[PDB]
Amino acid sequence: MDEKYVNSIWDLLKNAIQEIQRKNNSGLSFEELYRNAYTMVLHKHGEKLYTGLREVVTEHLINKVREDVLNSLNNNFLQTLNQAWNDHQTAMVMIRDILMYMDRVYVQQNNVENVYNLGLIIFRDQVVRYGCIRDHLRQTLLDMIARERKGEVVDRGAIRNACQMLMILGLEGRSVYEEDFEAPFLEMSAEFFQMESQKFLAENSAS
């Protein structure tokens, strides 16, 4: 009812979701955390809740990924990439299970995306679609497929996880996949096929 009461509830929810993002959501009474969400959105305060949650998760993303570009970029890139990917996936699934009633009542009102789609969109844009990480990931993928073409074996698990998470980020099919990975892949494959055809037809017979 009172605005300070709603603010205290929102701060408790912030502390709860931040503790969950720390991967220490074990011994913590979060049964109230739902009751709380319900009461909040029932006093029709869904806008606030949604927007603030967005803000919090987005800031968490900033911190984490600035950290990763500064360090995780080099040491085991795709490894820590898929690691943070599945960690964020588990965290956002838990948050969706917490805030499912909001996804039921408030999402269909303002025609906005659900918290799961929102989290995947912000992870695709702020973390994946960032400048200094996009070029690095595309260059690493092109390099690994190039060395795969010339005999050097690479762990197919990393590239298959990268491609599956890229097509998952589309939330509509392989949409982002066409522009983020398929567009350089087609041209690099085309030039590689041209080079191999030129080096094959020049000193070999048709047989």
């Binding site: 959501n25 074990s26 011994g27 913590l28 009474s29 979060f30 049964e31 109230e32 739902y34 009751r35 319900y38 009461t39 029932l42 029709k44 838990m94 299970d97 917490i98 499912m100 009633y101 039921r104 009542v105 408030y106 009102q109």
Partner: protein, 564 residues
């Protein structure tokens, strides 16, 4: 090779047998001190809330004891009952509290059943309360259904205490909606005045938003009375379907202002080979025929009734046996042009004499069932309670009888007798006998005189007095000789009239309505029903008097004009 039901119905009752004796209890729910041991598996399959809290696998899902707050113990027991049986206790006393508990637990099955149950529970008392209930929980289906009910009876529900406690957003959409059933704009103004003075300290800042929604410079029908009524005969109706057809929606005449008394003909003949029992109405003022939909879906031999509150209902009838008699009951929507269904009757009926008396609807006659037990079956219905109840049956079993209401008294007439029912005594009193024995006649009520006209028909008119209890002949319907007029007595413009369809030898059906002179005991030619409209309606048609929305009902010119 799929899922088996003979096994599902056995597995479910086996789970209930374990729940009653408290086996495999892995979680204990604590609600306001009361304990409710249950299974984490069952609650997840029924409620998505428990599915989210248990798949979490955190301290809550690890602790056999979970404290659920803001949840009623009675509603929680009903939710658990449904999870183990599939039966839902939905009464009008605890449906609003069950819906609050269901939406907090997000049970798709209970929320859907409680939603449709409330939709058919909106009457003329809980409409405003359910509207605020729907807005608080964001139920778009209940909110739209409750809003349309408020717009239909706004002049009767704005005195309730639930109306002055409505929120600001709940007021701006009701006043701005052009569906307010009000005869004058002052009613909407005074309704807004009583709302702002209910709580002045909190609504003093909303005084500008209140006046911005009430139409003050509209001048809907006060302009026609200003200049003059000079037009073709009663063409003030053509202006109704013209000013409301083109306007900026801020000065539009509200739907209540847009009303017209029309002779409602149900189960009439159809011009094109279609529904043998169609429903159309004719406005004597607009001289136009408006088509009415039949959600009854081919009902046959049904009855009609119009309350003094301008409410239309149908009961009884028969449907084609995939003919079988049913106990259906539908209410007509003056705005949506539909036929919502309402609590059915206790016994199936065919053409019951439906009458409204002191707010109660009575189903008289209607296809006597069980001749050994009783043939004079009659029962009443309560509008707000949505319930049927048996009453004192007719003293004798008759056929093709009529029923009227005068001065809160139920009068039933027969071959030559008449009995008066008193709801205050729940008994039948024999009244003055009729001098002529006639059947299949029409009956009407006007002032202190009951008219039993027609019957074998004939042109004989009988005027009965309630104050004198005497049957006397007054005059004969002036009709052409050797004709076969199937007459129907109707009261319009505070005057008794007779809608006479005359069919002569080798001639088509001719429709015409006459007006009776009460002081001179004469019948005056009132209006000739144009044959360019109103095609043949047969003889078994039912007729009544009511007001409908010319503004919005149906538009079917058809009726090919200028022939021969």
């Amino acid at each position: 090779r799929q899922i088996n039901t003979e096994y599902a119905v056995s597995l479910l009752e086996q789970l209930k047998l374990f729940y009653e004796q408290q086996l495999f209890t892995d979680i204990v729910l604590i609600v306001e001190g009361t304990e409710f041991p249950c299974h984490k598996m069952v609650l997840a399959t029924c409620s998505s809330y428990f599915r989210a809290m248990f798949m979490s696998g955190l301290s809550e899902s690890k602790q056999t004891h979970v404290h659920l707050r803001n949840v009623d113990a009675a509603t929680l027991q009903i939710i658990i009952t449904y999870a183990y049986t599939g039966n839902l206790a939905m009464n009008d006393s605890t449906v609003e509290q069950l819906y609050e508990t269901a939406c907090f637990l997000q049970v798709e099955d209970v929320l859907q059943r409680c939603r449709e149950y409330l939709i058919k529970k909106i009457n003329a008392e809980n409409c405003v309360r359910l509207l605020s209930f729907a807005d608080l929980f964001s139920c778009e289906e209940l909110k739209q259904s409750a809003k349309r009910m408020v717009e239909h009876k706004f002049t009767a529900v704005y005195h309730q205490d639930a109306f002055m406690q409505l929120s600001h957003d709940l007021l701006i959409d009701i006043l701005s909606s052009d569906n307010l059933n009000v005869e004058k704009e002052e009613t909407v103004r005074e309704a807004a005045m009583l709302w702002l003075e209910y709580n002045t300290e909190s609504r003093s800042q909303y005084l500008s938003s209140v006046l911005s929604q009430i139409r003050i410079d509209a001048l809907s029908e006060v302009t026609q009375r200003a200049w003059f009524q000079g037009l073709p005969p009663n063409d003030k109706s053509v202006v109704v379907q013209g000013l409301y057809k083109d306007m900026p929606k801020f000065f539009k005449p509200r739907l209540g202002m847009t009303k017209e008394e029309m002779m409602i003909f149900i189960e009439a003949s159809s011009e094109n080979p279609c529904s043998l029992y169609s429903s159309v109405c004719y406005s004597p003022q607009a001289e136009k025929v408006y088509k009415l939909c039949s959600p009854p879906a081919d009902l046959h031999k049904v009855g009609t009734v119009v309350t003094p509150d301008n409410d239309i209902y149908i009961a009884g009838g028969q449907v084609p046996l995939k003919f079988r008699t049913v106990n259906c009951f539908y209410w007509f929507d003056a705005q949506q042009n539909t036929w919502f269904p309402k609590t059915p009757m206790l016994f199936v009926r065919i053409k019951p004499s439906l009458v409204c008396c002191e707010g109660y609807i009575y189903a008289i006659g209607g296809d006597s069932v069980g001749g050994e037990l009783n043939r004079r079956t009659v029962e009443r219905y309560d509008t707000e309670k949505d319930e049927w109840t048996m009453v004192s049956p007719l003293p004798c079993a008759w056929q093709w009888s009529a029923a009227v209401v005068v001065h809160d008294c139920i009068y039933v007439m027969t071959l030559n007798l008449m009995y008066c029912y008193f709801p205050r005594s729940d008994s039948w009193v024999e009244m003055a006998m009729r001098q002529t024995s006639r059947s299949f006649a029409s009956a009407a009520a006007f002032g202190d005189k009951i008219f039993y006209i027609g019957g074998l028909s004939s042109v004989t008119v009988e005027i009965y007095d309630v104050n004198k209890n005497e049957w006397k002949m007054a005059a004969n319907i002036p009709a052409k000789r050797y004709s076969d007029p199937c007459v129907r007595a109707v009261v319009i413009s505070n005057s008794l009239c007779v809608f006479m369809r005359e069919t002569h030898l080798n001639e088509r059906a001719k429709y015409v309505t006459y007006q009776y002179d009460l002081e001179l005991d004469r019948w005056s030619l009132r209006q000739h029903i144009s044959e360019r409209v109103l095609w043949d309606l047969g003889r078994d048609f039912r007729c009544t008097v009511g007001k409908l929305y010319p503004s919005c009902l149906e538009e079917s010119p058809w009726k090919p004009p200028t022939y021969l």
